[PDB]
């Protein structure tokens, strides 16, 4: 139930896989934690607004259409999730 | 001797492999746990459609690999092959974040 | 007594339901009245864009030798059309992946 | 009892069979296509609503969409879409 | 004569003399302010319009507007705006 | 026999015209029905942001000893405030200039 | 009647003035014509839609309100010219 | 010996002066020449509000200024002070342009 340290739920080799998909060849050790902070900022923003949606939707379950709203209000538009 | 590929060969091979592949790379369960953790910061008593979670994973990964390619070309401009987070901060700030 | 029910899409020779389009306009509250040719023109340019992107998807799928098109075929179709990349640069695609793009500086010698 | 939900995937499938009778499609790909239809629809509809709001217009005709698409579409796509919608609206007008 | 052109210059100038009784205004800065307020007005009303779409609701309430305020405003701006609008709504309710 | 007409702005005790903005909402093609307190609330928060920006701009103009506001101090107010700047990152100002920003690496020995 | 070369009316002192206001210290000699082309591209990007505006507004005079629209659909929101 | 400042210092003073100042830096008459030059390529005999051209100017050099701080950040980030067009190209790519 109560969760504490999912900051390291992203593993470093997952980041290396993403970086090879991201075309990166040589990766510093300092990269992973900074990218962790960046992704935390991005998810805090979008999930905060998703919570705003769901309380405005008066629901205790989130929907992916809320996620569609969360991606569209900065134009990060994704297809195929009920849109 | 036992064989050892020189550095960069294997890395470029995985670059080809994962530019070929389309799937999510982070394990879904710890990401889901992180989603629950972050959403708990705003309000308790929340359930989660799984479709929302995979949407978050795909959008997040696409966002990350896009900024990875951006920092990649930035480090290419900076005459390096080793990425350092100063490139990431420059890319965010010029991009506007 | 009354004429045969004949669809406006067939009248415009079209496929997309122009009645549904016009209804969604009316529920979209874009104007208090809408001219008749407006949802027809909407539908028609939607089959135009749809035909173009599905043409590109078919080109990708025949290049990818698979009969049923997949989101990877969609990504590979759209992202080598740079004109769409001006059109849809801010668009993300589920399970589409990325263009395989390795720079010559990553290449040795 | 299930609530009937409107989706364009049948229209996407028939468009695909028009351009490629031999070609199939996945359900998530049809979801992407329906998302595309809705996305372009809301873009063009909001843009047309604003252009109506500028010139104090309360009735939307295909001229306004023609303007708004030739705004939103660069290159040859705008010219070809204007031409095709012109033929469709014209022979509809005769109909 | 000419047609009346509505302006917020009187109302914003009243608010100005509320917060800065001392200072004057330029017409260029006031055109900036009017372009500002009309821009952000159509912004907040637009997201409220999408909320009306997503909630399938015909009548716009204040609740939807406070939600859209959490959508637009950065942080303590949003909380203070919620507070001030809450008090204004209460005394409007009591007229 | 009608009672004395107050304004809804006076009913909220505020500056902005509730009737004007509510009329804007009704003819904006946004909804057919609008609740009573929503334009009042919107006028209140517009008053809040207006007073906030105007107060900071007046302080900035007081910093450079002028009692009439100019777009330069508008730029100084909007860009030195991270919530305001983030809120209007995509916003251009005419004759506001930019924040003076000198890189220390450009500075000599 | 026609216009053939006003892009070389973009003086490199003006370019370097914007560079100083843009914070650029040392400038290569090859910069000027490329920035001229880039800003020119930006100009057609705006004025194409501005021409479309004036055409749909059924006029032969370009007004600043259409300029406001032309900047704003790329989100380059400029205040003081709307009204 | 006649007075002569070392290079860059006058450029620094220009930077400071222009970061305080807000006025247009191009002579405007060639700017309307360019405006009508580009405008007649879409439709000829279009007339212009002078305010329309001033809005075009303010947006234009505003975009150029922001591009110039990004270009300066690129020039610094590759361990230099002098700009080259590769800064501009990288900025155009990372801005999505």
PDB file of C-alpha atoms in Angstrom, chain F:
ATOM      1  CA  UNK F   1     -42.739  49.236  -9.175  1.00  0.00           C
ATOM      2  CA  UNK F   2     -39.334  47.733  -9.913  1.00  0.00           C
ATOM      3  CA  UNK F   3     -36.664  47.807  -7.221  1.00  0.00           C
ATOM      4  CA  UNK F   4     -33.456  49.784  -7.649  1.00  0.00           C
ATOM      5  CA  UNK F   5     -31.159  47.938 -10.034  1.00  0.00           C
ATOM      6  CA  UNK F   6     -27.835  47.076  -8.470  1.00  0.00           C
ATOM      7  CA  UNK F   7     -25.084  45.626 -10.625  1.00  0.00           C
ATOM      8  CA  UNK F   8     -23.797  42.111 -10.139  1.00  0.00           C
ATOM      9  CA  UNK F   9     -20.359  43.710  -9.787  1.00  0.00           C
ATOM     10  CA  UNK F  10     -21.768  45.741  -6.891  1.00  0.00           C
ATOM     11  CA  UNK F  11     -23.388  42.570  -5.545  1.00  0.00           C
ATOM     12  CA  UNK F  12     -19.905  41.081  -5.481  1.00  0.00           C
ATOM     13  CA  UNK F  13     -18.455  44.486  -4.572  1.00  0.00           C
ATOM     14  CA  UNK F  14     -16.020  44.305  -7.484  1.00  0.00           C
ATOM     15  CA  UNK F  15     -14.739  46.439 -10.347  1.00  0.00           C
ATOM     16  CA  UNK F  16     -15.214  44.340 -13.476  1.00  0.00           C
ATOM     17  CA  UNK F  17     -18.539  44.312 -15.393  1.00  0.00           C
ATOM     18  CA  UNK F  18     -20.268  40.996 -14.721  1.00  0.00           C
ATOM     19  CA  UNK F  19     -22.891  41.672 -17.384  1.00  0.00           C
ATOM     20  CA  UNK F  20     -20.295  42.389 -20.072  1.00  0.00           C
ATOM     21  CA  UNK F  21     -18.234  39.271 -19.370  1.00  0.00           C
ATOM     22  CA  UNK F  22     -21.310  37.065 -18.976  1.00  0.00           C
ATOM     23  CA  UNK F  23     -22.568  38.387 -22.303  1.00  0.00           C
ATOM     24  CA  UNK F  24     -19.148  37.534 -23.757  1.00  0.00           C
ATOM     25  CA  UNK F  25     -19.514  34.012 -22.370  1.00  0.00           C
ATOM     26  CA  UNK F  26     -23.020  33.587 -23.774  1.00  0.00           C
ATOM     27  CA  UNK F  27     -22.162  34.868 -27.255  1.00  0.00           C
ATOM     28  CA  UNK F  28     -18.787  33.149 -27.215  1.00  0.00           C
ATOM     29  CA  UNK F  29     -20.396  29.904 -28.531  1.00  0.00           C
ATOM     30  CA  UNK F  30     -19.241  28.148 -25.359  1.00  0.00           C
ATOM     31  CA  UNK F  31     -22.508  27.038 -23.761  1.00  0.00           C
ATOM     32  CA  UNK F  32     -26.187  27.834 -24.042  1.00  0.00           C
ATOM     33  CA  UNK F  33     -26.511  27.974 -20.244  1.00  0.00           C
ATOM     34  CA  UNK F  34     -24.100  29.682 -17.864  1.00  0.00           C
ATOM     35  CA  UNK F  35     -24.570  29.693 -14.107  1.00  0.00           C
ATOM     36  CA  UNK F  36     -24.927  32.946 -12.228  1.00  0.00           C
ATOM     37  CA  UNK F  37     -21.833  32.840 -10.037  1.00  0.00           C
ATOM     38  CA  UNK F  38     -19.329  31.761 -12.688  1.00  0.00           C
ATOM     39  CA  UNK F  39     -18.933  35.184 -14.440  1.00  0.00           C
ATOM     40  CA  UNK F  40     -18.727  36.778 -10.989  1.00  0.00           C
ATOM     41  CA  UNK F  41     -15.960  34.352 -10.048  1.00  0.00           C
ATOM     42  CA  UNK F  42     -14.153  34.941 -13.343  1.00  0.00           C
ATOM     43  CA  UNK F  43     -14.300  38.711 -12.852  1.00  0.00           C
ATOM     44  CA  UNK F  44     -12.900  38.213  -9.345  1.00  0.00           C
ATOM     45  CA  UNK F  45      -9.910  36.169 -10.493  1.00  0.00           C
ATOM     46  CA  UNK F  46      -9.277  38.493 -13.426  1.00  0.00           C
ATOM     47  CA  UNK F  47      -9.256  41.271 -10.833  1.00  0.00           C
ATOM     48  CA  UNK F  48      -6.754  39.263  -8.773  1.00  0.00           C
ATOM     49  CA  UNK F  49      -4.320  38.710 -11.639  1.00  0.00           C
ATOM     50  CA  UNK F  50      -4.788  42.287 -12.837  1.00  0.00           C
ATOM     51  CA  UNK F  51      -4.008  43.736  -9.411  1.00  0.00           C
ATOM     52  CA  UNK F  52      -1.049  41.363  -9.016  1.00  0.00           C
ATOM     53  CA  UNK F  53       0.578  42.224 -12.353  1.00  0.00           C
ATOM     54  CA  UNK F  54      -0.265  45.922 -12.003  1.00  0.00           C
ATOM     55  CA  UNK F  55       1.171  46.068  -8.486  1.00  0.00           C
ATOM     56  CA  UNK F  56       4.427  44.410  -9.514  1.00  0.00           C
ATOM     57  CA  UNK F  57       4.648  46.631 -12.597  1.00  0.00           C
ATOM     58  CA  UNK F  58       4.048  49.730 -10.474  1.00  0.00           C
ATOM     59  CA  UNK F  59       6.763  48.617  -8.064  1.00  0.00           C
ATOM     60  CA  UNK F  60       9.152  48.088 -10.986  1.00  0.00           C
ATOM     61  CA  UNK F  61       8.300  51.519 -12.408  1.00  0.00           C
ATOM     62  CA  UNK F  62       8.895  52.997  -8.955  1.00  0.00           C
ATOM     63  CA  UNK F  63      12.319  51.330  -9.033  1.00  0.00           C
ATOM     64  CA  UNK F  64      13.216  53.410 -12.094  1.00  0.00           C
ATOM     65  CA  UNK F  65      11.582  56.618 -10.724  1.00  0.00           C
ATOM     66  CA  UNK F  66       8.767  56.918 -13.285  1.00  0.00           C
ATOM     67  CA  UNK F  67       5.114  57.315 -12.322  1.00  0.00           C
ATOM     68  CA  UNK F  68       3.663  56.226 -15.682  1.00  0.00           C
ATOM     69  CA  UNK F  69       3.860  52.556 -16.609  1.00  0.00           C
ATOM     70  CA  UNK F  70       5.761  51.605 -19.770  1.00  0.00           C
ATOM     71  CA  UNK F  71       6.092  48.200 -21.519  1.00  0.00           C
ATOM     72  CA  UNK F  72       9.698  47.882 -20.304  1.00  0.00           C
ATOM     73  CA  UNK F  73       8.572  47.515 -16.689  1.00  0.00           C
ATOM     74  CA  UNK F  74       5.798  45.218 -17.888  1.00  0.00           C
ATOM     75  CA  UNK F  75       8.495  42.953 -19.337  1.00  0.00           C
ATOM     76  CA  UNK F  76      10.547  43.306 -16.149  1.00  0.00           C
ATOM     77  CA  UNK F  77       7.550  42.293 -14.035  1.00  0.00           C
ATOM     78  CA  UNK F  78       6.482  39.370 -16.221  1.00  0.00           C
ATOM     79  CA  UNK F  79       9.945  37.886 -16.744  1.00  0.00           C
ATOM     80  CA  UNK F  80      11.368  38.257 -13.236  1.00  0.00           C
ATOM     81  CA  UNK F  81       8.392  36.321 -11.818  1.00  0.00           C
ATOM     82  CA  UNK F  82       8.782  32.612 -12.497  1.00  0.00           C
ATOM     83  CA  UNK F  83       5.086  31.772 -12.128  1.00  0.00           C
ATOM     84  CA  UNK F  84       4.149  34.692 -14.372  1.00  0.00           C
ATOM     85  CA  UNK F  85       6.988  33.952 -16.805  1.00  0.00           C
ATOM     86  CA  UNK F  86       6.130  30.242 -16.943  1.00  0.00           C
ATOM     87  CA  UNK F  87       2.481  31.199 -17.386  1.00  0.00           C
ATOM     88  CA  UNK F  88       3.424  33.407 -20.359  1.00  0.00           C
ATOM     89  CA  UNK F  89       6.539  31.759 -21.779  1.00  0.00           C
ATOM     90  CA  UNK F  90       5.093  31.850 -25.303  1.00  0.00           C
ATOM     91  CA  UNK F  91       4.150  35.527 -25.008  1.00  0.00           C
ATOM     92  CA  UNK F  92       5.847  38.385 -26.877  1.00  0.00           C
ATOM     93  CA  UNK F  93       5.990  41.978 -25.616  1.00  0.00           C
ATOM     94  CA  UNK F  94       6.257  45.068 -27.808  1.00  0.00           C
ATOM     95  CA  UNK F  95       8.959  47.541 -26.681  1.00  0.00           C
ATOM     96  CA  UNK F  96       9.400  45.636 -23.427  1.00  0.00           C
ATOM     97  CA  UNK F  97      12.926  44.585 -24.306  1.00  0.00           C
ATOM     98  CA  UNK F  98      14.445  41.617 -22.488  1.00  0.00           C
ATOM     99  CA  UNK F  99      15.853  40.968 -19.064  1.00  0.00           C
ATOM    100  CA  UNK F 100      19.501  42.083 -18.954  1.00  0.00           C
ATOM    101  CA  UNK F 101      21.256  38.730 -18.760  1.00  0.00           C
ATOM    102  CA  UNK F 102      25.049  38.624 -19.035  1.00  0.00           C
ATOM    103  CA  UNK F 103      26.906  35.329 -18.974  1.00  0.00           C
ATOM    104  CA  UNK F 104      29.780  35.351 -16.496  1.00  0.00           C
ATOM    105  CA  UNK F 105      31.852  33.275 -18.921  1.00  0.00           C
ATOM    106  CA  UNK F 106      31.611  36.231 -21.327  1.00  0.00           C
ATOM    107  CA  UNK F 107      33.104  38.478 -18.648  1.00  0.00           C
ATOM    108  CA  UNK F 108      36.867  39.068 -18.933  1.00  0.00           C
ATOM    109  CA  UNK F 109      39.564  38.323 -16.373  1.00  0.00           C
TER     110      UNK F 109
END
